[PDB]
């Protein structure tokens, strides 16, 4: 596991800044032809506008600073999301997003000490409600 697409310079800086909580949201995309991971968006995003960030017509990777209280503690925990809207994506788009995931997570972890608390795979991010996200990170 699995296939490592070079993460662009720009992208790597966004992720780094997320690791230091200077950014709260970093969205990446794969350039299929170039076999490359490139920076799509770093628009400052609160939980309540996260759904709007998730494209409904192509697949994306997301790293999102999830600010929330857990039984006494305010936690600002990094969540990873792989979003995939369905057959609007080509097989090749689906295989690459699926296949290029683990190595991307490996770099962020070993080099940026990102502390990815949870990874989530979703269809559209209507799903990404307040209670959904709390249940993912803090199950029962």
């Amino acid at each position: 596991q699995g296939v490592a697409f070079p993460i662009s310079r720009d992208a790597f800086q966004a992720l780094e800044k997320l690791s230091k909580k200077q950014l709260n949201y970093v969205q990446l995309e794969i350039d299929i032809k170039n076999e490359t991971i490139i920076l799509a968006n770093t628009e400052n995003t609160e939980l309540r506008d996260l759904p709007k960030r998730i494209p409904k017509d192509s697949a994306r990777y997301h790293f999102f600073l999830y600010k929330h209280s857990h039984e006494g503690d305010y936690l600002e925990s990094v969540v990873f999301i792989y979003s995939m809207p369905g057959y609007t994506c080509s097989i090749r788009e689906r295989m690459l997003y699926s296949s290029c995931k683990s190595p991307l997570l490996e770099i962020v972890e070993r080099q940026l000490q990102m502390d990815v608390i949870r990874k989530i795979e979703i269809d559209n991010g209507d799903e990404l409600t307040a209670d959904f996200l709390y249940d993912e990170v803090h199950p029962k």
């Binding site: 369905g86 994506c89 097989i91 689906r94 683990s102 990874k119 795979e121």
Partner: protein, 372 residues
Amino acid sequence: ETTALVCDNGSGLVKAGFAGDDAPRAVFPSIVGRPRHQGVMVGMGQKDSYVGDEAQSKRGILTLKYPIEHGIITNWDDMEKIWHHTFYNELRVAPEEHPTLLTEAPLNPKANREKMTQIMFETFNVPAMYVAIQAVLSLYASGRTTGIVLDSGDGVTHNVPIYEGYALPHAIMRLDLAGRDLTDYLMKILTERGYSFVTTAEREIVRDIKEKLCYVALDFENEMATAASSSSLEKSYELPDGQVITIGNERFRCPETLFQPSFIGMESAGIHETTYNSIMKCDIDIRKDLYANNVMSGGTTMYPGIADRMQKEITALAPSTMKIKIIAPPERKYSVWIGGSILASLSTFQQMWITKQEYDEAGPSIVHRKCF
């Protein structure tokens, strides 16, 4: 241009081809044949063996064998012949010039993965090769790394939970019933309807019937009743000479066997129950996402209405407040092969191959380390 080969070896059929093509170029039976008795056969040629289509045509002269039983390779002498035949006869390539991706079944012994790589390097002299789990390739192709794949091919049906690219071997269910069993039951009950199919020329004809007319009922007894008391759902089938026979409740009774294996005697849970059990053997936690991501692969999941039926059955077995989805891609018949082609065609895949140097230095395995 050196070009990578991709091979998906199944119990019934070999799908083979070039990485980057979007469909497998060679699809032919995983059948090896050898002279029926000892002395001089007629007309055995100047040859000790046949593979694939030729082996079918000369069935009367040969003893036919499947080297892959239930996804696993059990006859290595015969498996070598299928590979040889795939390279030289089907693909027209010289194996030594080409990186080869190969696929493997659930619950495949580690020793088997090793002899597989061993043979590729020692006997076929591939410069590089690599091995991928079928179920994982299909999951990944559907655009997800976690879910439960229901792979149903020609001789085996597997339920395989996968977490984050990794199959959970302890939760993998195996069910020895698939396409070849379904063609034969269609043959049986079609002959009971008063026609006659015994007979290997006829088995072919029934395979085409099965593959073009069959469907899975949403509600089986509804449909049996809807057929007994009306000629509503009767498709006519053109025999290849000109006769025309009429096919009725067989049309859905045949793949019903998947959910109701008692139909062919066998005491065993159906595909819905096995996929429930598989799930149930996992984390209480992970279960949520298994249910939400049931992916289907393999030719025996190609029946119309199979997706919906699963939806019905799974729901009926699940906690009432469970989010259940089945994903049944249009490409699912060769999704395993398509996924390898996509992978083996990427420049960034050049440094993922196991090489001859790596294998020499050594040896076979290399495979468990470098591929997963």
